[PDB]
Design a protein around this ligand. Sequence first.
Ligand code: HEM
Length: 154
Amino acid sequence: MVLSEGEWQLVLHVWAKVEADVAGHGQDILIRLFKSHPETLEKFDRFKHLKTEAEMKASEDLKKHGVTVLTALGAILKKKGHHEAELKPLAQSHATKFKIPIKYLEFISEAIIHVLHSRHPGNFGADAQGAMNKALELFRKDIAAKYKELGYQG
Ligand code: HEM
């Protein structure tokens, strides 16, 4: 797939808002993922112990890891499709070290869209959401192909 420049503009416009509070969005997104799809929490030895939203919210390590996630994702989006180098080490660790199936990348993509829709309704209308979904679908497709080359494709 190929996004038009118009579609990237919509993606990066909303993302500029997200970057005003990377830690806060990171927390919201991972908490949404873990509440909506509790099975994903089991992939994180680091956080597996967290029982409630309240404990997740209070967790400093979890907040630090959401910054890491969104920083990495933000660097990929700003490449506007030219992300091969950024994707290689991410694919390798998530395929070989953590074993994260593509279905779980779908789940976090849904969590991202949910939080952006909640926090940025004015900059995340139907067209902006379609553009962000396309950018994330592009991301998942490219990571799936790399997974395959690496021997995983999960
Ligand atoms: C937008 C999707 C994602 C991005 C951009 C992302 C980014 C990252 C980054 C940058 C790291 C640290 C460096 C590395 O090991 O490569 C990381 C660690 C990790 N990721 Fe992801 N990730 C994503 C989705 C997921 C999902 C969906 C899961 C689990 C269901 C996951 C599980 C993990 C685990 C287990 C770690 C290690 C945590 C620790 O430090 O103990 N990731 N990810």
